[PDB]
Symmetry: D2
Subunit: 499 residues, 4 copies
């Protein structure tokens, strides 16, 4: 008698004992007479083409795979609801926030960043925390991480950053020279790197970590007034981390530790939950903010910008088929219902394009008609047609052009976007040296105690150890810019690692 | 007031008059505020990425097209039912023939062969007549033509034949040298070419032609007893042809003559129907048959093997969305319910591989989950999993391996196929010199009268004249092998056409 | 003996006449022993799987087709050169214009707009005129039409317009009600529609029509100064059109009239050529221009902005394999070498995204690695890696991330784009009511003579007659906004055809 | 200084030291002026579509992934040559064996079977060992394992078997009951399962293991005489394994232990070499062989059928780009040059279909035109045309149909297959009850010593304990069917694991 996950097949048989097993059929529904023996000429003769039973199964096996996610490939999924606990209709007119008590079905995916489909869960890396809201004003995808910040603040460095985080193009091995050459040349990453190599770099499962929308977003109320915001969904189960000692053992003992823990939790009625908060910044407060309010490498301090609670996230359902419901999950930051809008955040702007595009590649042009991705709580009506694997009535014989005098769907003026005024030059602005150390200086000295600062440099030194000396001296110098003792600790550890 | 086809949008709006038009939404279900004006900076400024309304629409527009069919690309569709009128249960145990009165939902596609998506309907070519039967034991695709025979009798020559009937690989033009160089090198085409260039080469729409399964098929009844058979669909609307003169006029006046003719018919309640007949040959009679009974270039003469009535095919429903319902239609001759099986027809054996193969490319690995391709009157249960665009529960948490101790689907031993034993060396047997002339001589002398043979040579000479003299003399000689006068009539016209 | 098009294979054999025929192989290069006969057990036995010769040919045949172009599917191709004849280096620093006499290889594709792969060439429609310049600064794609203007001025209407021009989503028929309903609700189409329905709507082949960039572009010289421009590449063969009477005859007599004609021309040494002009507008003149200089439904009058000659485009080579060379051609308006840039033209803005997107769908992620699409006169080096069907060294073992301390490719600061200043509310500005008639009024009264206007109304009336009366009366008033006699001439024709 | 693998970028820079960095261009070859900062409106403004530098970079990143291999996903690659050292031309007429001393370029891929792209290398599993021979008669793909046998002997069980070895359809976890539920229901796997859980289940890298073709193949010499054969390709480095103790440790310390080991070896001049042997069975010996000579779960004993040496395979070159050269490597067992032919092995027959099929999905229809998949030592000439991503001239304007009178490729009668005679009922013959225990018994009793048997049982029990008890005792029952002492040593241990 084992954990509920391993008893998956066992329960399925029990859940069906009263029923008789179905007739085994071909993909076309034709009953198979025998599926253990190939159609051959004589007992030791060759196989026939006429064996259409064989081909139909064999061919589908051959196409079982789809391209994995280009980032965050290793993933865990769950389902539940979002429930409003406070009224913030003064900030957002989004129906998902309409009144206290309102529930919205959600879909959540947890993931790592660099690891592939088969990688270990208990490794040092950021963690994905994507949430899909099935609202009546369409689907809302809040694709956030377990950190309030990221390593870079311009989307043009994202493909580069990821490459450096993955495998060498010739050797196909993880190479720390790629890792630290990038990080040391781009000191803006100092903030997020400090987070990653801290205790929270290896969370104890998916239920013991916080989530952040990271990006500054725009909220718009009914009168047409707008504010900026941050999304924080903090763990109700409490922050708990794994030791570098306990994370490494698990890496071979249970590669899918996070997958198994989440599944076991929900299956056993122990439902994990998060409390959704926001921070709010007025357009006025945005212009006087000491840093760039849309810099993804920046946080909003809690003292100046307190958390305003909105609701609860509860995961109370395990997926039924992992592939069909979790691996085919597609999240689009461009999915924003009326009342929630993007800020001019350089990184967020890039994500508005990238995600729908990649889903059309990874899953298909009509990925939005896949059940788990469908906005099934909205009525989709538009002038979009066809595409590979078209799955519904394709909107019937409805007029497919707009405008028309034949009463096909109409635009909704209520859903017009907030109008902002901008001015300046149209060119590429250098953002590389906005203040990269001040908030990092704050994190190191004020948030961490002396013991965590000690482990922080150790985790850093242990990985920086593999880079060339010129990359090392560059990294240490970048760290010294945060705090001299911080920089001197890492290199002090390095002088011991270099024998 | 006009024909029903053109009034489609008019009728669509009338059908909705009580309702108010829907809110125009994105694929993610988010209402759009305006879909007539782009998000720009100032009235004459640049476009913004944060405008996801444009991208989501445009990106979908970009992927509207899927590969057209490699052959029979130009198509017309309709739906209806198959109804059993006579008892043929002594020959087949197939549920589709179970008792008199039995109805099966069907799907029919009509097509030409060589023309691409935009070509004219009224051209000389064979015609497709594919019928999809939605039976309880899965789908039955009886994929037939308007001819009992074909141009070739070996599956390895099919790509070649097709290439020769389509466009020249350099000029992208129809090439008479490609067409007849082939035909003259493969005299077996003499039978079907004679059919093609007769009156029935250009049918007056799809409602005035017969359809044939062409292939000899196998029928197996409840006792496991087997016979060979042919399928015949004779028009209840009567054979009716176009003169080449009026077919040519319609080619520019109405490129979609056959498509609209069908649509207008059904919409005005005038439902087209065909009468299903069979011919039956016992294992005893097959071996004493003068020719190869599985030779696709051979008919079974009515004198020896008369038609046995089975039922009626009735088309009484038009497609609602052509693309979702007719362009994504997939017929697999390999889709055969218990009671219907393949003969050793070299060509039919080849078709068992090709169609499922091409559909996985054209539509996708999971093309059978598309509504019109789905066997919705049967329960698909098997150990096939995953694949791109997985659309249902993916059969849940059911055990995905076979055999298993967990009550996942089981084979059904009753649905085993009839067992025949075969022998001779396993080798590549030459089929080039089976009787190519006897049945053709028969067709020329017995079935055609003096005026139709006269037009037959005129229709042939009119096309062969564009081929080189060495090809003409080669083709004519093949026609001379059929009948001296047949060869001599063609050469008489060619000498005038050659100036 | 026949035209060069018909003798393609004939010449192919003679051009090879000295050599022995090559060994017929599988895709894996294995020689075939027999490709006319299937491997079976006994002369009348079932086909074997062990026949991998059959499978390999058939499997490839099954995948011969790729998704056709969403628009401009019916096409003719040629290759040649662009030669600079005049000096415009004071306007553009682009290498393609560097000195007089300089030649650059080009590729040209001709197309209609609405017709599918099999549709007729000689129909009333705009004509595609895409030119790809293989410059040292990368490829330059000038994707223009045979008209200086278009039907719409916002990219959000393009999917709408196209749908209206193609087949009904239910009946799959061309629908005059769809066609004019769009046009009548959108009077901005009045300009281009006026072009389309008089003589130049049906050009006599591809060599007797002009080409236009239509869009306003930006030119930037060595001093960093910018101007706006229009591209006109006018035919050296002279404008020549087909009458409605016989253009219709060719639709059925020779569906590929332009396809054959273009091929025949080059092969017989008559190389077609076009003379490239530009028009130039300063930023200052853009500010005083009476209309929106980026309204695609507007021309720059020759009086105000005279043509400046640049060079010749000459097509002097026929393609060798149509598919590999013309069907796989991908033109990207986003392909612009340093010195040539986009204006804030809304329609042009949309094309920057749309074209690269669909090409990744239609052809593939690595579509730029296809020979005709490859920038073979430039050195492609970047941090792009992998993707489906990667065909080269994949840039070797070079570092794939940027920045790096390992001497991977570097930015070229000179190649930065022009800096413009923009400001205004970020909002969707209504352009629906920009002047729709003035330039149209000018075209009607000043450019056309009395019979061309008479023929113009006939062609419109001949097409509009099939639409509903409310659509007719709506359209006529739109035409009346151009000129009272114009609307009334059309209306005089409609009242008798409506019996 | 570090291992050669880690110094890849260091060395890349050195090889380039004289050179200055390339001009960074778009995929279309246009140089980019700045690729670190985005095109925006104002320093803190929104992103523009006009930034095509960004869009195309992101879009290509979005499409970097292709479906990983459905099996054998985790892989290592190397290149070298095959050298003939002995004469076996009396057995085979294949050009790869034509004379002593002859060298042929090879491509090798090493792999696990079940693990995905991110899985650990040092796990208990079979090892893939594929060799691609680039012969003048086309490519010869010898797709073998590190075992002479397999778990099953019929192709219809392969997809089922694989699923059981992979992840649970709901929980997405490795599931021990799935593994053994299958294995215990199919006792033929006892042989391969016995091999797997012995020392050689976890080899010390890829250079310390043997390769086997496993399948019986056919050899044909010039006289048309045929023999059956097994390929045994033995390591020159000697068998060397990792204990499970350090194999578990290496699993988290170095996920790509084998990948790095292979690369490091080749880079340091330490070239791995293996010796190719064959076993030969005459048609006469096949009829008297006590077991099925085509049973993939059976070996040919060395005593009756001694090893005949053929040549050497040597790997002396590392890949330059892993993706282009190793991840896109495609092996087809159906790729067989004249002189090598398939036996009637049920499993091998299935693989003729499966591999070409899956590659058309994974890589593309035209995957054989990929450099590493291309038969560059052969001339591909045939009548195959078009398809997505066509990369050469597509065989020019050559005639695309066969037969033809225009001197296109001709079949080569020399390349006909060996002709065999067969007889029997065409039916599905049951292979479940061929002798499943005898050859396993000798391995346990005669080949293993007393300590290896002890560990064999420990490793099984260590893994089998996780399955349900009803599954365990059934599996244990199979082990006792091999030998009573073998079964209960295992059973003594499971009962210890059952607390
Ligand atoms: N046996 C068959 O299935 C067919 C036979 N034939 C040809 O007729 C010869 C004799 O057949 P037999 O059965 O002995 O005598 P029949 O006269 O009974 O064969 C009559 C068949 O010829 C068909 N037919 C009549 N005119 C044409 C035409 N212009 N183009 C194509 N088909 C036409 C009829 O179609 P309908 O059924 O509408 O009268 C009928 O099916 C055969 O050798 C064969 O070549 C022709 C078609 C099929």
């Amino acid at each position: 008698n084992r954990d509920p996950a391993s008893d998956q097949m066992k329960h399925w048989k029990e859940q069906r004992a009263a029923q008789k097993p179905d007739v085994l059929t071909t993909g076309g529904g034709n009953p198979v007479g025998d599926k253990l023996n190939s159609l051959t000429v004589g007992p030791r003769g060759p196989l026939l083409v006429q064996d259409v039973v064989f081909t139909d199964e064999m061919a589908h096996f051959d196409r079982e795979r789809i391209p994995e996610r280009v980032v965050h490939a290793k993933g865990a999924g769950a389902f539940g609801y979002f429930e409003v606990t406070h009224d913030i209709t003064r900030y957002s007119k989004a129906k998902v926030f309409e009144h206290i008590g309102k529930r919205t079905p959600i879909a959540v995916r947890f993931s790592t960043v660099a690891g592939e489909s088969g990688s270990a869960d208990t490794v040092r890396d950021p963690r994905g925390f994507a949430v899909k809201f099935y609202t009546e004003d369409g689907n809302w995808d809040l694709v956030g991480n377990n950190t309030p910040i990221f390593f870079i603040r311009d989307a043009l460095l994202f493909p580069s950053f990821i490459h450096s985080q993955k495998r060498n193009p010739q050797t196909h091995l993880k190479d720390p020279d790629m890792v630290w050459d990038f990080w040391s040349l781009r000191p803006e990453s100092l903030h997020q790197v400090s987070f990653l190599f801290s205790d929270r770099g290896i969370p104890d499962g998916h239920r013991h970590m916080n989530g952040y929308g990271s990006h500054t977003f725009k909220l718009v109320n009914a009168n047409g007034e707008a504010v900026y915001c941050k999304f924080h969904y903090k763990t109700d189960q409490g922050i708990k981390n794994l030791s570098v000692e306990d994370a490494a053992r698990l890496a071979h003992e249970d590669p899918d530790y996070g997958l198994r823990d989440l599944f076991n939790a929900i299956a056993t009625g122990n439902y994990p939950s998060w409390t959704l908060y926001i921070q709010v910044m007025t357009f006025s407060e945005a212009e006087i903010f000491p840093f760039n309010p849309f810099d993804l490498t920046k946080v909003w301090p809690h003292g100046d910008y307190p958390l305003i609670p909105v609701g609860k996230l509860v995961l109370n359902r395990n997926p039924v088929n992992y592939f069909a419901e979790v691996e085919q999950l597609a999240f689009d930051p461009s999915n924003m219902p009326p009342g929630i809008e993007p800020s001019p955040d350089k990184m967020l702007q890039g994500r508005l394009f990238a995600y729908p595009d990649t889903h059309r590649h990874r899953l298909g042009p009509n990925y939005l008609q896949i059940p788990v991705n469908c906005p099934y709580r909205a009525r989709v009506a538009n002038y979009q047609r066809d595409g590979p694997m078209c799955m519904m009535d394709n909107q019937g014989g409805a007029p497919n052009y707009y405008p028309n005098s034949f009463s096909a769907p109409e635009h909704q003026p209520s859903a017009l976007e907030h109008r902002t005024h901008f001015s300046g030059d149209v060119q590429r602005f250098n953002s590389a040296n906005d203040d990269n150390v001040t908030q990092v200086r704050t994190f190191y000295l004020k948030v961490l105690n002396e013991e965590q600062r000690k482990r922080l440099c150790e985790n850093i030194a242990g990985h920086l150890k593999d880079a060339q000396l010129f990359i090392q001296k560059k990294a240490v110098k970048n760290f010294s810019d945060v705090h001299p003792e911080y920089g001197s600790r890492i290199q002090a550890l390095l002088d011991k690692y270099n024998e």
